[PDB]
Amino acid sequence: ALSLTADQMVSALLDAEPPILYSEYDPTRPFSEASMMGLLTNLADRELVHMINWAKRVPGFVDLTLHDQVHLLECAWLEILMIGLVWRSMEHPGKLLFAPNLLLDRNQGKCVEGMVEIFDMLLATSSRFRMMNLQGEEFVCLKSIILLNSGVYTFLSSTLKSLEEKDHIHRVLDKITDTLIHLMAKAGLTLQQQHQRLAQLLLILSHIRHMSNKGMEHLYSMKCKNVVPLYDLLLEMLDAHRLHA
Amino acid sequence: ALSLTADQMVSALLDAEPPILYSEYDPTRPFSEASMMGLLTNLADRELVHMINWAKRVPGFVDLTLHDQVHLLECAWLEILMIGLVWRSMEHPGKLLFAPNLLLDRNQGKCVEGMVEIFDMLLATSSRFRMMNLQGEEFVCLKSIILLNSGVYTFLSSTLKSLEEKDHIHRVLDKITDTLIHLMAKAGLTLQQQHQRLAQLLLILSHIRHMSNKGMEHLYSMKCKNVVPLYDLLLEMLDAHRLHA
Ligand SMILES: C[C@H](COc1ccc([C@@H]2Oc3ccc(O)cc3S[C@@H]2c2ccc(O)cc2)cc1)N1CCCC1
Ligand SMILES: C[C@H](COc1ccc([C@@H]2Oc3ccc(O)cc3S[C@@H]2c2ccc(O)cc2)cc1)N1CCCC1
Numbered sequence: 125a126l127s128l129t130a131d132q133m134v135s136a137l138l139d140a141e142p143p144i145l146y147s148e149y150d151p152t153r154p155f156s157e158a159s160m161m162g163l164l165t166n167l168a169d170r171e172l173v174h175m176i177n178w179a180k181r182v183p184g185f186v187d188l189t190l191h192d193q194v195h196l197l198e199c200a201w202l203e204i205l206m207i208g209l210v211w212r213s214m215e216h217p218g219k220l221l222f223a224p225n226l227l228l229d230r231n232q233g234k235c236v237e238g239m240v241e242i243f244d245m246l247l248a249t250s251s252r253f254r255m256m257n258l259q260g261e262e263f264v265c266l267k268s269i270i271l272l273n274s275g276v277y278t279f280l281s282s283t284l285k286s287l288e289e290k291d292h293i294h295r296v297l298d299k300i301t302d303t304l305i306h307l308m309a310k311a312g313l314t315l316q317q318q319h320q321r322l323a324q325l326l327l328i329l330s331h332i333r334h335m336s337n338k339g340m341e342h343l344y345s346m347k348c349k350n351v352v353p354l355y356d357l358l359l360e361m362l363d364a365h366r367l368h369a
Numbered sequence: 370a371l372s373l374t375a376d377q378m379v380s381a382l383l384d385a386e387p388p389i390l391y392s393e394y395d396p397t398r399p400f401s402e403a404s405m406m407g408l409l410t411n412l413a414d415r416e417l418v419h420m421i422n423w424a425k426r427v428p429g430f431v432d433l434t435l436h437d438q439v440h441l442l443e444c445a446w447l448e449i450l451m452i453g454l455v456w457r458s459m460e461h462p463g464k465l466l467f468a469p470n471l472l473l474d475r476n477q478g479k480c481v482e483g484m485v486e487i488f489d490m491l492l493a494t495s496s497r498f499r500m501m502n503l504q505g506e507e508f509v510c511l512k513s514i515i516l517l518n519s520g521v522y523t524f525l526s527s528t529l530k531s532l533e534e535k536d537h538i539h540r541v542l543d544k545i546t547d548t549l550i551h552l553m554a555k556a557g558l559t560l561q562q563q564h565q566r567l568a569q570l571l572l573i574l575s576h577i578r579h580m581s582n583k584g585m586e587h588l589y590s591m592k593c594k595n596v597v598p599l600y601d602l603l604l605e606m607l608d609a610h611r612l613h614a
Contacts, residue, residue, distance in 0.1 A: 248522050269572070277493050277576045294569070301568040302561065316547065319564060323546040324539070326571040327514070330578045331522045337582035 125183030125296045130306035133183060133299060137264035140181035142174035144212065147226035160228075160235045165348050167223060168205055175204055176361045182268045184296035192279065192289050194358045199275030201354075202336040203329075204267060206246060210332075211263050213250040220246055238342050245335045252328060256321075259311075265304050266325060270332065272297050370428030370541045375551035378428060378544060382509035385426035387419035389457065392471035405473075405480045410593050412468060413450055420449055421606045427513045429541035437524065437534050439603045444520030446599075447581040448574075449512060451491060455577075456508050458495040465491055483587050490580045497573060501566075504556075510549050511570060515577065517542050 125133055147167055149158050179197060180186050186193070213221045220228050220243060233243035272293050279286055304325065308318040344350075370378055392412055394403050424442060425431050431438070458466045465473050465488060478488035517538050524531055549570065553563040589595075 245523065252522060273572050273575065274579075277497060277573075278490065297568070297572070298565045301565050305564050315560075319550050319567060320543045320546050322564060322568060323542070323571055326568055327518050327542070327574070328522075329572070330518065330575045333575045333578045334519075334582060337579060341586065 125299045128183055130303040133303045134261055136183055140178050142178045145170050147223040171205055179271055182271055188289055190363055193362050194355055196275040197358050198354055200270050202339055203270045203274055203332050206335055207267055207332055210246055210250040210253060214254045242339050242342055249331060261307050265300050269300055370544045373428055375548040378548045379506055381428055385423050387423045390415050392468040416450055424516055427516055433534055435608055438607050439600055441520040442603050443599055445515050447584055448515045448519055448577050451580055452512055452577055455491055455495040455498060459499045487584050487587055506552050510545050514545055
């Protein structure tokens with residue numbers, strides 16, 4: 125993503141966006157009978173498949189080794205789901221738009237032990253986004269930064285290959301920084317407002333990390349899923365042949 | 370911190386730095402006999418007292434209500450210890466400088482179940498700092514951002530007071546952003562390198578959040594301490610009289 129213009133990065137990222145999926149419950153049937161966590165887990169599993177396709181279209185990602193791609197997604201997948209949730213919840217004060225047919229308030233989260241704490245964090249993030257007037261162009265930049273950043277400090281090694289990979293990633297993160305500043309300049313913010321808004325945006329990423337960690341903690345205490353480790357499922361998805369070319 | 374110059378912010382922050390404390394073990398006695406976690410916990414408890422004094426000298430902090438001060442420190446204290454640890458470990462490749470008389474490598478962390486995972490994260494952060502050539506002026510800015518940012522999205526309320534507080538905090542974070550850019554400009558980086566370096570710095574804060582969350586998880590499974598909730602201990606420390614004026 126190192127010779128692509130800022131305008132080329134932005135349209136690539138807008139072109140790569142995944143679809144908005146629906147919850148799978150029968151809407152002709154009552155609600156007292158649906159497992160909220162089963163509904164949420166099924167939604168999340170379905171989104172993950174589309175996340176892999178998206179990641180492959182983030183400039184620079186597929187130039188990485190397959191191992192490193194798996195590591196980055198293993199590190200970032202919940203941050204990536206959550207920022208997407210807060211983004212589509214932005215125009216819906218007090219509610220989380222998990223899917224177009226599944227819009228939940230905080231009292232619906234009390235439905236699950238320990239879940240209202242996570243709901244409240246997501247809702248607050250959504251409110252911050254709304255107050256900053258975050259733009260779709262800025263959002264796709266931030267989601268790609270999460271992908272490239274969250275796992276880059278935990279690669280074990282420091283083989284020559286590994287050092288080359290880290291370098292490449294930092295290079296791509298740097299172009300996305302240039303892209304966010306370009307977007308802001310185009311919008312006519314001053315120099316000073318650009319850097320202030322860039323910092324405001326990147327500091328929310330620390331909150332998103334916090335919510336992912338808390339949600340991983342919460343998830344690891346119910347039924348959700350942990351059959352076949354995540355790494356292997358990600359590897360299968362990412363390690364594609366080219367036969368269906 | 371909203372009429373203070375960038376140069377005034379930087380010297381206030383340099384003036385506020387806490388002291389480097391020593392580990393309390395008898396150095397005339399063997400090491401096989403010291404509880405590494407007891408040594409680390411005692412060090413951390415001692416640093417906390419000095420952290421409160423530091424926080425009160427961060428521009429804008431004491432203009433907050435006492436409740437909000439307690440909340441911010443309750444949210445950020447482990448991130449603040451850890452960034453300080455990685456900073457003083459920077460010139461010591463492969464080791465963590467917990468104190469001048471307590472310099473540990475990763476094999477010394479294996480000493481505690483589940484601790485080498487945290488050590489490895491801290492060491493990697495330290496290596497990133499060293500590779501970025503982080504400067505003492507940039508460090509104190511980042512530590513103050515952690516203080517003001519980590520808890521600002523989780524205040525419950527939205528009383529008028531609460532909305533005023535959040536506004537003030539964002540205002541102070543904005544001046545620290547201006548300060549980091551000033552520092553970088555003074556150093557003669559280009560416009561482009563400034564924004565890139567600002568983003569590189571703020572993205573490491575997401576890793577520091579990650580390490581704090583993982584370390585809180587790890588800490589909550591041993592002896593460390595949880596007698597009298599943290600809030601109340603922080604409140605006592607922060608709720609000072611002015612008699613010793
Ligand atoms: C089994 C596990 C399910 O993961 C989940 C399950 C549910 C959700 C929960 O539901 C969604 C659904 C879609 C989405 O875009 C975001 C969320 S967030 C929420 C949640 C997250 C953490 C919590 O502690 C509580 C609620 C998010 C992720 N698989 C997901 C794909 C890889 C593993
Ligand atoms: C009892 C609790 C002790 O907290 C601790 C105890 C030990 C340390 C450990 O030792 C220090 C000591 C000083 C310092 O500046 C950083 C660290 S980090 C490390 C550690 C952190 C998390 C882990 O899972 C493993 C190692 C850091 C914090 N009190 C600290 C003051 C408030 C509560």
